[PDB]
RNA sequence: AUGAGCACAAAA
RNA sequence: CCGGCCGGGAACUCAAAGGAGACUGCCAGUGAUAAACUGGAGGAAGGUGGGGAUGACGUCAAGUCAUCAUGGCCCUUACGACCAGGGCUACACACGUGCUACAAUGGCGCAUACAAAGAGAAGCGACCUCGCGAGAGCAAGCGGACCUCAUAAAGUGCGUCGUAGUCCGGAUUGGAGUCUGCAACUCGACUCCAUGAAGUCGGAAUCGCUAGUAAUCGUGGAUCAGAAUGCCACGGUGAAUAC
RNA sequence: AAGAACCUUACCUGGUCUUGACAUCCACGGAAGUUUUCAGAGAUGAGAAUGUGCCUUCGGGAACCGUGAGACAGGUGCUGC
């Protein structure tokens, strides 16, 4: 998929994830994990979620 | 040093916490320090407003407080302006956005911080200590709950030897963990030394 | 006891030893660093090592190589 | 296949939060596994009770973090929309994960 | 066909599953003589079967986690008693007379503050 | 109450964070064996007061060096008071 | 077998 | 492919939430026809089931002005402040608390079995390789029921030693190092090679313990760059004795 | 004292600073910050190089830094009788 790589400070959107339809800034990107941490506040608490690069596609 | 803190022993059983947030290992110490700084500033600014309890709940994007005041008109000022300046300065003290919530407390003679602070202000104003704790005990008993005990210790009446003198009415069971006892202390700082106030109030059993 | 990957010598003491060996025989060099391992370059000089209140002079020779400077300066006084 | 773990200092609060999550996941219709309890971390701290010298006189404390996982395995669009502000409690520290 | 016992010591949980069959028994995919037949307390395992006055008629399968050697042996004995409870009801008079129905609640008490152990105080000088 | 001591700890934290993780980690990397030397003699130029080991954990309330607890961030005397008033969340007397 | 003397304001 | 194997009701264990359960509730006797006690049935547990938290009015002018706060007194170009080194680690001695021993229920080598409790992001740090070792190498995983610390040890069989200052004991010392940290002289912790003090169960006196107790065996945490024989917790084996 | 290697330091020898290492008020200015040379045991003292913005009513806002003066700051100094 095009633009599959993400960086700190990039919009994300997951079809099966709950952090879509709201603003999303990622936490950490790890190549050994093959997945990236996304830090979106939930009821005002920042929460990291690990999602596969093919699984999450930016808007 | 015989007696344990009543709030401390029944914190697990009946009394909720003065700070009810969650944090991990890394954020715990700095969250405690921020809570200390915001509570210190609120108490310093609102000692004339006589706040009893400052309940702090942090979502961990912002921080909200539930401050308890006998006169909410003093803390809101005019049209919420004093609340607005206090919210802004407590926000840029804490380094994180803030929401201030104020709960009007009922029975100010039946809550212990304001009883102890009133006795402290009377010892600043050199009211005699026997009349101070006698009025506190009789007013709490006529206004409400069936337990009252006020202990005032240290340099009583300008003496060179400190004494501990306590009045008590009703029933105040400290050993029963079912009891609703609120313990709060306040220190009065006279010209000849410092003098401490210990107040128990027993609401009932839960 | 130290690591094999590096011996230790203070930079100011090393540069003063360099000045002493390019000058020749000179006044005792005053050092406050007892931590420094002496060297074959420092073998021969007459520098003075401080121990608390007073500085003692030490004439470094070939038997003292891996030892620090402060082994020859006594810290305490008994009897 | 998002699995949501949640921890709190209070067992009643984490019970209410987990009940809210399973009710929201079950009103729209989603296959969610039962809320399993992970073991609680019991942090024993042990402090002296006196300012000066009293070694035997010494106090003992505890932090009990109650950790739970709600175990969602079916994703639905109304579910992933409705997980936003679910627990709504300051004590509950929820974490979305795959 | 399978009769189950809970089997706890205060440190070890011995799930015992008894069937009718061969009298040879298996403790954690391993024979009892391999498990602690080199040690003692094989007889305390055999005692609930010895109270029924026959051993060979039943086949016992045992899994046990936790504890030490005698703790696992006692938990196994407790599990065999509860599995014989699932077997029959008339055995309870003999098992209760032998006292094997009860559970051992003698745990280890915690180390108390100011003492080197649970009970042991440090040495005391009057001076 | 120990104003100079707390000032020295603040200055130590500031100087260590300024001069560390930009030079000291590289000097330690060159000090480590690659998987006397001119490289290590160039390396031996290190100043002293930037070290992280010179810092000592002091209580934020009182500046007390001894009796510190890291997760609470305070000394034991202050930790007992905050626990008894109910400020440290989840703290309970372990009556076990 | 023995233990210096004073050091208990605590009040309308 | 011995990976407790994978669809898995999830049985069972386990984890933590709501409950049940024990109240002298019964049945005889004693007493006063009273509380209560003695036995037994039942039951997992029986009479406070076991442990813990909880420590009245007060005593000792007991302890802390050095955790903090504070009344009074004092210094305020010096009892304040910043640095380098040294000291708090000294040593003719006396005392308290512990550790290791004086061996044969033991020491040493090989092979093996069974836990609980915890900690981890300036962190715990697999596997593999190198080094006799402590350890060292761009090496995965895990903010944790998964990954790491992490090997439990007394035990069990085998073989050896056969009462010696010993194959008991490890102090001390001299060489060779590893780790940590800006630096291990004063003044660190381990490893290796070598040496092998006293010590043959201890005068007067004296300490703890009534059951999972004492003894004995290991394990983890706090503090902490590093450094416990101290502290705090954890479990394995497991007594003797109360007329 | 749940951790004494100059560093935790209070104690000692020596080199130094006196509105101060830690706060607030006044005036003069300079952003801050970063790199580097000479000494010295370091504290420090002389130099330089780089950067020099968000501003508003260019009031060079406000932090931070330095300098002069007092108000004061500081005390792990004494008395837990």
Distance F21 CA to I76 C1' (A): 35
Q: C-alpha distances in angstroms, D59 versus A43, B1, B72, E110?
A: 37, 13, 39, 15
CA triple F78-F82-F87, angle to 5 deg: 150
DSSP state of A51: E
d(CA D77, CA D80): 5
Structure tokens at D43: 């942090």
Beta bridge partners of E59: E19
User: Which chain F residue has its CA at the smallest distance from D41's CA?
Assistant: F90
Q: Say if CB A51 and CB D98 are below 8 A apart.
A: yes
Chains touching chain F through at least 3 C-beta pairs below 8 angstroms are B, C, D
Q: Phi and psi for B31 in degrees, rounded to 5?
A: -70, -35
Domain boundaries, chain D: 1-98
User: Which chain D residue has its CA at the smallest distance from E115's CA?
Assistant: D56
Domain boundaries, chain B: 16-106, 107-206
Q: Say if CB E27 and CB E64 are below 8 A apart.
A: yes
Q: Is E114 on the interface with D (CB under 8 A)?
A: yes
Q: Say if CB D9 and CB D42 are below 8 A apart.
A: no
Alpha helix locations (H) across chain B?
6-9, 28-45, 72-76, 81-94, 112-124, 129-143
Q: Say if CB B83 and CB B98 are below 8 A apart.
A: no
Greatest Cα-to-Cα distance within chain D, rounded to the nearest angstrom: 63
Closest CA to A36 of A15, A7, A9, A59: A7
D87–A47 C-beta distance less than 8 A: no
Burial of C22 (0-12, 13-18, 19+ CB in 10 A): exposed
Q: Write down the number of H helices and E strands in chain B.
A: 6, 7
- Total Cβ atoms within 10 A of residue B110: 21
Give the position of tokens 């059983």: B13
d(CA B169, CA B176): 18
Q: C-alpha distances in angstroms, A36 versus A4, A10, A46, A57, E42?
A: 11, 12, 15, 12, 56
d(CA E17, CA E80): 8
Structure tokens at D83: 């997980």
Q: Say if CB B180 and CB B154 are below 8 A apart.
A: no
Method: cryo-EM
DSSP state of F68: B
B15–F89 C-beta distance less than 8 A: no
| CATH number of the B16-106 domain | 3.30.300.20
Structure tokens at B164: 């501990």
User: Which chain D residue has its CA at the smallest distance from E122's CA?
Assistant: D56
Q: Collect all residues with Cβ–Cβ distance below 8 Å to C34 and sequence separation of at least 6.
A: C49, C50, C51, C68, C69, C70, C73
Give the position of tokens 């990039």: A10
Report the residue from D84, D86, D95 with minimal CB separation from A22.
Answer: D84
Distance E126 CA to G1 C1' (A): 23
Domain D1-98: CATH superfamily, name plus number: Ribosomal protein S10 (3.30.70.600)
Chain D contact set for B22 (CB, 8 A): 7-9, 90-93
In 3-state terms chain C splits into helix, strand, coil percentages (rounded to 5) of: 20, 15, 65
Say which nucleotide is closest to residue C15, CA to C1' distance: I39
Distance F9 CA to H74 C1' (A): 29
Distance of CA F64 to the CA centre of its chain: 14
Structure tokens at F54: 């010179």
D81–A18 C-beta distance less than 8 A: yes
Beta bridge partners of A47: A40
Closest CA to B190 of B145, B158, B153, B159: B158
Give the position of tokens 């989603």: D30
Beta bridge partners of D43: D63
Say which nucleotide is closest to residue F94, CA to C1' distance: H53
d(CA C74, CA C56): 9
What is the fold, at CATH topology level, of the domain defined by B107-206?
Ribosomal protein S3 C-terminal domain (3.30.1140)
- Total Cβ atoms within 10 A of residue F60: 18
Query: D80 CA to chain F: closest CA distance, Å?
Result: 31
d(CA B134, CA B137): 5
Query: For C23-48, b where at least 16 C-beta lie within 10 A, e where not — what string?
Result: eeeeebbebebbebbbeeebeebebb
d(CA B10, CA B5): 9
Distance F4 CA to I27 C1' (A): 29
Give C35-46 as a DSSP string.
Answer: TPBP-TTTTT--
């Amino acid at each position: 998929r095009p633009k599959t790589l993400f960086e700190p400070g990039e919009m994300v959107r997951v079809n099966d994830g709950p952090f879509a339809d709201f603003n999303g800034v990622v936490e950490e990107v790890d190549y050994e994990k093959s997945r990236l941490k996304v830090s979106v506040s939930i009821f005002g608490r920042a929460t990291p979620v690990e999602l596969d690069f093919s699984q999450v596609e930016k808007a | 040093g015989q007696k344990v803190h009543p709030n401390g022993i029944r914190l697990g059983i009946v009394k909720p916490w003065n700070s009810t947030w969650f944090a991990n290992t890394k954020e715990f110490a700095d969250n405690l320090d921020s809570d200390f700084k915001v509570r210190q500033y609120l108490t310093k600014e609102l000692a004339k407003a006589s706040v009893s309890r400052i309940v702090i709940e942090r979502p961990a994007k912002s921080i909200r407080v539930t401050i308890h005041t006998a006169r909410p008109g003093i803390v809101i000022g005019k049209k919420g302006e004093d609340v607005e300046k206090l919210r802004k300065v407590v926000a840029d003290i804490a380094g994180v956005p803030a929401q201030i919530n104020i709960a009007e407390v009922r029975k100010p003679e039946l809550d212990a911080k304001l009883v102890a602070d009133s006795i402290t202000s009377q010892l600043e104003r050199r009211v005699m200590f026997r009349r101070a704790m006698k009025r506190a005990v009789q007013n709490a008993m006529r206004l409400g709950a069936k337990g009252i005990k006020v202990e005032v210790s240290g340099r009583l009446g300008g003496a060179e030897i400190a004494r501990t003198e306590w009045y008590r009415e009703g029933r105040v069971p400290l050993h029963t963990l079912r009891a609703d006892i609120d313990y709060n202390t306040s220190e009065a700082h006279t010209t000849y030394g410092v003098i401490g106030v210990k107040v128990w109030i027993f609401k009932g059993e839960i | 006891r130290s690591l094999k990957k590096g011996p230790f010598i203070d930079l100011h003491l090393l540069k003063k030893v360099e000045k002493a060996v390019e000058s020749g025989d000179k006044k005792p060099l005053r050092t406050w660093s007892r931590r420094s391992t002496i060297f074959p370059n420092m073998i021969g000089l007459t520098i003075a090592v401080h121990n608390g209140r007073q500085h003692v002079p030490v004439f470094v020779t070939d038997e003292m190589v891996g030892h620090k400077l402060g082994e020859f300066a006594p810290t305490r006084t008994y009897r | 296949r998002i699995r949501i773990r949640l921890k709190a200092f209070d067992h009643r609060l984490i019970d209410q939060a987990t009940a809210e999550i399973v009710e929201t996941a079950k009103r729209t219709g989603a296959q969610v596994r039962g809320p399993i309890p992970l073991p609680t971390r019991k942090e024993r701290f042990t402090v002296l009770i006196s300012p000066h010298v009293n070694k035997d006189a010494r106090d003992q404390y505890e932090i009990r973090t109650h950790l739970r996982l709600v175990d969602i395995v079916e994703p639905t669009e109304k579910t992933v929309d409705a997980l936003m502000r679910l627990d709504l409690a300051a004590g509950v520290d929820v974490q979305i994960s795959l | 066909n399978q009769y189950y016992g809970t089997g706890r010591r205060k440190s070890s949980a011995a799930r015992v599953f008894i069937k009718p069959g061969n009298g040879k028994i298996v403790i954690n995919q391993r024979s009892l003589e391999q498990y602690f037949g080199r040690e003692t307390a094989r007889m305390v395992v055999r005692q609930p079967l010895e109270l029924v006055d026959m051993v060979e008629k039943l086949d016992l399968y045992i899994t046990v986690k936790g504890g030490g050697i005698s703790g696992q042996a006692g938990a196994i004995r407790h599990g065999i008693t509860r599995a014989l409870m699932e077997y029959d009801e008339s055995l309870r008079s003999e098992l209760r007379k032998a006292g094997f129905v009860t559970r051992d609640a003698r745990q280890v008490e915690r180390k108390k503050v100011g003492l080197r152990k649970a009970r042991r105080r440090p040495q005391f000088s009057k001076r | 109450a120990k104003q100079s001591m707390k000032a020295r700890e603040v200055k130590r934290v500031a100087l260590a964070d300024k001069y560390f993780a930009k030079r000291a980690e590289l000097k330690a990397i060159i000090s480590d064996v690659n998987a006397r030397w001119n490289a290590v003699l160039k390396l031996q130029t290190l100043p002293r007061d930037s070290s992280p080991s010179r810092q000592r954990n002091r209580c934020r309330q009182t500046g007390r060096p001894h009796g510190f607890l890291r997760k609470f961030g305070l000394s034991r005397i202050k930790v007992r008071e905050a626990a008894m008033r109910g400020e440290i969340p989840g703290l309970k007397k372990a009556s076990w």
